[PDB]
């Protein structure tokens, strides 16, 4: 058998990708937001020395 006609394959999609999303969102609120808030004040600079 060959030259099979147009099949009707069905896929549910949407694998377990949203699970890992909770990891980055949880680690940011614990160390990203505080760092961004602390950096807003007394912003340092860099020169030639």
């Amino acid at each position: 058998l060959s030259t099979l006609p147009d099949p009707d394959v069905r896929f549910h999609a949407d694998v377990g990708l949203f699970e890992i999303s909770a990891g980055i969102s949880l680690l940011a609120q614990r160390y990203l937001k505080p760092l961004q808030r602390l950096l807003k004040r007394k912003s340092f600079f860099y020169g030639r020395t």
Partner: protein, 99 residues
């Protein structure tokens, strides 16, 4: 979803080290900077330079890690996989006669 287990693992699980850099950064070069606020202007001329030099060295030392992570991330974008097969059968009685 069970097929993307190793992919998601090598993508995110091993990538925790990337986010971990922010932890040490906020713990060292942020919370220990209170001495600069309570320092006189006579000392700020050198404190700022010392902080900048200390931060530049850390950035240069951690830069190769970013490149290594970027290069390893490409490993999860390789189009490779096996195949799947199926089967099917059916029966149907025709005729019968005693003996």
């Amino acid at each position: 979803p069970m097929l993307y287990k190793e992919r998601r693992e090598t993508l995110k699980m091993v990538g925790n080290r990337l986010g971990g850099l922010v932890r040490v950064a906020h713990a060292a070069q942020d919370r220990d900077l209170k001495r600069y606020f309570k320092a006189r202007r006579k000392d700020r001329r050198k404190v700022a330079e010392e902080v900048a030099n200390g931060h530049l060295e850390l950035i240069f030392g951690w830069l190769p890690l970013i490149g290594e992570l970027e290069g390893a991330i490409e490993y999860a974008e390789l189009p490779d996989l096996d195949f799947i097969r199926c089967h099917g059968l059916h029966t149907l009685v025709l005729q019968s006669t005693p003996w």
